[PDB]
Amino acid sequence: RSNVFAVDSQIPTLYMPQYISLSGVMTNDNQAIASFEIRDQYITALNHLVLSLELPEVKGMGRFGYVPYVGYKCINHVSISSCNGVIWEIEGEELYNNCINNTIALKHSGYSSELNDISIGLTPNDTIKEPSTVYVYIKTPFDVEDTFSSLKLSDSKITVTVTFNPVSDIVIRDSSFDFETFNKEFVYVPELSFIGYMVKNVQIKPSFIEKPRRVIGQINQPTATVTEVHAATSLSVYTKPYYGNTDNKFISYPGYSQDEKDYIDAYVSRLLDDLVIVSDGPPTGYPESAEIVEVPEDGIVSIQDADVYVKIDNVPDNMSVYLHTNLLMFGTRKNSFIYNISKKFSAITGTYSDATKRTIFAHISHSINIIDTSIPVSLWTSQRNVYNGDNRSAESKAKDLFINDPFIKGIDFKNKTDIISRLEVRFGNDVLYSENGPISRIYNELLTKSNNGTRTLTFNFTPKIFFRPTTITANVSRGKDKLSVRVVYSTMDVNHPIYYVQKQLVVVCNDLYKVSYDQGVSITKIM
Amino acid sequence: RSNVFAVDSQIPTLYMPQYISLSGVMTNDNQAIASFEIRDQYITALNHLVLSLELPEVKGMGRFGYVPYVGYKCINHVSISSCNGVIWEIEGEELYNNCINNTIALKHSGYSSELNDISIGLTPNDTIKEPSTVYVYIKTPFDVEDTFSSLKLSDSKITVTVTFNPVSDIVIRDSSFDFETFNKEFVYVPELSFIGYMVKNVQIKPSFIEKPRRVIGQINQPTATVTEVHAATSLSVYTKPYYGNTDNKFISYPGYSQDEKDYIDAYVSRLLDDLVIVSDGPPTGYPESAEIVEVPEDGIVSIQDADVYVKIDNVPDNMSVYLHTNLLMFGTRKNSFIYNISKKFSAITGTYSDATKRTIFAHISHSINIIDTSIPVSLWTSQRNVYNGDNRSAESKAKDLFINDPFIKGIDFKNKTDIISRLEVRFGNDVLYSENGPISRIYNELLTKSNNGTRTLTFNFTPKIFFRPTTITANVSRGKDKLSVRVVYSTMDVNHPIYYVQKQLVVVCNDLYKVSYDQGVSITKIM
Amino acid sequence: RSNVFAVDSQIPTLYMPQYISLSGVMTNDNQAIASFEIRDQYITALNHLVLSLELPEVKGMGRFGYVPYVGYKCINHVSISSCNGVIWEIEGEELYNNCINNTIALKHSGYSSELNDISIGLTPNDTIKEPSTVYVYIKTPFDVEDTFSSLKLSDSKITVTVTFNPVSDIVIRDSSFDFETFNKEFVYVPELSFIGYMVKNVQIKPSFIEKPRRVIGQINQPTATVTEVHAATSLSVYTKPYYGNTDNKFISYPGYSQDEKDYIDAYVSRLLDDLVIVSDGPPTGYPESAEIVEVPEDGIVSIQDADVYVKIDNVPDNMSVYLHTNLLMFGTRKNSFIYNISKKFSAITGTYSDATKRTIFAHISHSINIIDTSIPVSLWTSQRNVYNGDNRSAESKAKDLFINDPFIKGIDFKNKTDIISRLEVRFGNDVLYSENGPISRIYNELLTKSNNGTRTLTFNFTPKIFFRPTTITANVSRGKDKLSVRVVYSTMDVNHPIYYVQKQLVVVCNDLYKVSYDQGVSITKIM
Amino acid sequence: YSENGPISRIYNELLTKSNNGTRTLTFNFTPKIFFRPTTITANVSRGK
């Protein structure tokens, strides 16, 4: 019988860990680059890299806030090199995707009301935001099995290089803020930390590492190809929107609250102030194409099949209630279907306030959705629209927000709508996999215990470090050495504005490399 | 010294995985049965079964919604067989209990506002719900240790059989919905997926598997017995309510919000509209036994020791405020204690709205609880009640909801009240365990890291796959081969309606089986 | 090739577990001590200790509630001994810190609205709280590796001793409650449970255990020293506030809601009733130093550079709106800076209610923070304050609350502000580590997956039970046998009241011990 | 086999010299009567 009530305690290698901190050299649209040099013959191994960033004080007038997870979204590229060349590198988006399921890292990276609330400044000497510091955990393959997986520095020099995104990407602002001055006087201040191990009489053996590789397809094309595939462990596919042909302005943004319900409530709250107006006589200051009608005594206004129920309490006797019946409208033919935001409301109740001269709304019933909240403003007024699209007031038009978040997926802010209806993967010339529904995404989320998975084919099911990984292997004789992907996009109604948002296909492939430790660190591609 | 900075990488067996999808055959109260046939000599092993289901479009008038986790609650039975007979089977409730701690699986199975909100239809051509698809992860013993635990198909035919519950169980509806037509036209559409492994020169060895077995006791009896117990790893006990002697109608249901506070708020909100009435003269349309009194100037109404504080703002000068002092009442003797829902309120404030002709309530102080929210409507008006129980208006009575959820535990919707005060377990003739408090439930939750544990005795503490499991073993000579359970139910007040809800005892025992792989797959009970 | 599709099932040692429960002996400011005796020659091992506590019924008048996690916060000290002396002991605070990341244990220990809401009693026979029971999971080193790590009772007697805190520490109450009677009649009722293992022909081997050791520094001194350090695995540092020179009264407490936003909202809600007053003529009943001014027609009141915007609807025609412009004020010089809570508000809106004769506030904009919510009341009126600090009404002063929570860290209730700006650790005479930012706290939280880490140096990275732990080792020849810590506290503004809160430094060191099993259990310090 | 456009119909019409072909997969290209026809053959072991 095997003893399950006692073990023989082994004596491990003698070692001692130490926390080490390093400052870097900054060089320069003058993109910023930081280089860190690690040189000590007693540092045998290292892992758990952490980058710190100091954000400065912001003063002035206007409305201003930071995007969520600013620390992660400010990183463009990370590279680790030695004298024999690059050992490992990754783009920022792949790091974000790999760390998306680590709530503690996300919270440390910068997620709070003080940072993400949309603050207001009244005078040129008002302080909008106080200074603070964020920390970005750079997860690497060397962390998966603590000491067993650490990187051994066989008496070589290691260089870490971090490239930063321009500061315009991480800021949410309105047109009143003095962005040119802010951008001229903003500077990045970084610092790198890691855990080192001092080892006595180490015995080194070769090991194995995986390197991700990204390919971006052409605009609106439904194909992409990865060449020189000799040993891959997985393949991932997703899409990105391209907003380069707009001015990047949006009607609303919820800030710290990030639920779907919060997005919808913020949008509806921004529209309600202009949708129902209490005025003495016909309201002035609107474009000529506005159709503002008076609410009857029974409270029901008909807008061609749609009925809106409006009841306001405490209305002064010298005033009346009016309804804006075409706040935003879009159509491609003069007598075809019309997308009209006014017809998405069914009941509106509230009470007028004499002290503040505005209406305080109570219960609202509506059918607004995330696509409506995600339509960009500039598409409402494009040349293909035969109507005047934006019938809002100037005060409302002055509150639009610039949003330049670089890691948006799908065609909406939450990646909720699935726009891929069929996927087909070919390895060489033969079909390797085809599916209609998102069963591969379901399987990815189940196996990785994540809420934000993507369509992924996984080929390796063996434990990571103690076994050689299982791969799909090339056959250059028959020509099986490339993976081509083809999708069919869903069909949308030609009268919905979201139909004209352009998109790009993204394919990610994980290649296998061999690590040898004679003459320092070097890698060789497995063939 | 043992090296903790390097390992020897072993070469694993050569294999290649593949995702496989299969369609099934449907046969037929004409209970639906699906059969799936797996036949390929190169599929050596499989695991991670996933079932997909397509839910259709629902049109018409009335109020309609789906129960939470509809995908799990639609499954009655799953069986896996070969030519030598059954290999593994389980009922739906045991699967649900085993998967209750997997948040990602639960969310995939169907949990969202679009599915679980109580929608309203106005015309016979209104679309209440759009079509969608859910996925049910069928967790099996073959998943616990990836490749090591997979099921080996030694050149045999494998059949999977799924039995479905009738559609009436998964729908929450009011009496206005045309359920007979919906039930006549509804059809199940299923599809099975799994991960297969193509292995080269496999070397097979025998292994071990555990099979659950459920016993259901007689109505209201506090005993149950499991026969033929020769090697069991655990024992579980819980209770179920039986609502078969009612019409299954309830006053309220919160829908997507599933907190205790949400249940209580929905119930209170449904009662408040009928509890306090603002009217010009005595309200009409109520049964003769109603006692509706006028609120005095100081705002305090006395109902025999209980005092209710009522203050309403903006009351028109031609109207008064009335209070319904016996909305729901129950008692067994003419002059004994009375359970009166009106006496559970202490303060009610709000403001009357002239535009909508209703009262908008603000702050409420009350002592309603989950048992009150869980009492079925038909028990308020049973024959043993000497009063007229339901003094609500017809409009309120028309809003009751049918609820037929099949996996309810305890006597309330959240299984919060503990109605078992003492438990005694006998193995053979001798007492094996006895307890007063729920220390076994505490231990179960601690050891399995679950929030919804049950009273469970665990006999196996060894690692699952690499060791033979530890069991309790029979001694047929002394006659130790059966487990009998006896409980004592808590004592409730004879004047509470919940006292008359019937219940059933459920016992679950996990038996051990041996798996051999010569002549395909076969099992033999360990004796 | 190694087989990854099959294993050889080993046969384990024959054993059988059993749940055992014991009652204890109580002895006696007459601090309570419980002793439990374990004596059975067939109990070979044990782990998973659980303590249960019965809380009694509380009746009377006033406001009363329990602190969160009362079960954990009621424990002062736990000790485990045999005939050879103490085997393991720990203070309550170290246990709480070790278990802080176990949500299920925390929830079982007593965390609910019924326990933690601030209830109100109206008559001397009112029932404020019903009786209930809590359970405290006493996590020990013997649990980390189930059967492998269990404690072997080599035919010796084991004694467990639990010391309890006085009941005044676990209760939150106002001055109206009859605490002297409650404290005279309260009694502790405990019971211990554990899992025992009956083993046949056990084969015992020696093992390894770690014992924590706490040192508390002197008041306001920034140094502390641990002597006799021969083999330590880690070192931790944090600070505690000392409230012994006050009366322990606070303005508000949120109860069950424990977010920062909840603290701030409760504080603001308590202040708003006294900050803005609607009255017929100048309000009476305030001290002579109050400066109450009338709000002009434009609604803007200036308080030296600060502007407050006040708009109240539905004000009766015989009444006016007044603003209290110096509710709480503190300063050290007659014409220097003043901390004035009235200047932290920028906009206040609401509606007066005629029925209840009070103002119902709607939207509030403010800059109150957690330090303001955490300032104790007695510091507002200290002798060093040259103004009259507390200008509230007597009714408001009668609602203050006593709070005596014993496990508060930092200087605020959430330990959010970091008051340590530099840390330096010396081992012997030489500097072992120094840092400016909290990178060690970041690393602690990352490595232990916790949200509430402390500044910790970790020296052991090897797996716990199967390897001998790595330690830092003394060199008595050079005199390296002591660890001295020195901090520099942050600098605060001399006109903020929080500057005068006293603090204490706490250092925790984990020493290594050897366990041998000949002649029962005994330990010997590794040298 | 999988296809998007009607290339199989084009091939059917080309090979049979017809104006009204359908989507057809042809497996036999040998002369009809003097040779045994070429077929696609089952593999009941793998279940094809």
Author numbering:
A (entry chain O), B (entry chain N), C (entry chain M): 18 to 45, 49 to 547
D (entry chain P): 453 to 500
Pull text from the paper.
Single-particle analysis of symmetry-expanded, signalsubtracted particle images of trimer sextets resulted in improved cryo-EM map resolution at 3.9 Å, enabling further analysis of intertrimer interfaces. The structure exhibits two alternating modes of intertrimer arrangements, which are mostly stabilized by electrostatic interactions and agree with the self-assembly behavior of D13 with varying salt concentrations of the buffer solution. The base-to-base interface involves cation-π interactions between Y62 of the CDN loop and R498 of the GHC loop. The second mode (mode II) also implicates two intertrimer interfaces. Torsion angles ranged from 7.6° to 9.4° and from 12.5° to 13.5° in mode I and mode II arrangements, respectively.
In Vaccinia virus (VACV), copies of the double-jelly-roll protein D13 bind to the viral membrane via interaction with its partner protein A17 and assemble into a scaffold surrounding the viral membrane. This process leads to the formation of a spherical immature virion (IV). D13 adopts a double-jelly-roll structure composed of 8 antiparallel β-strands.
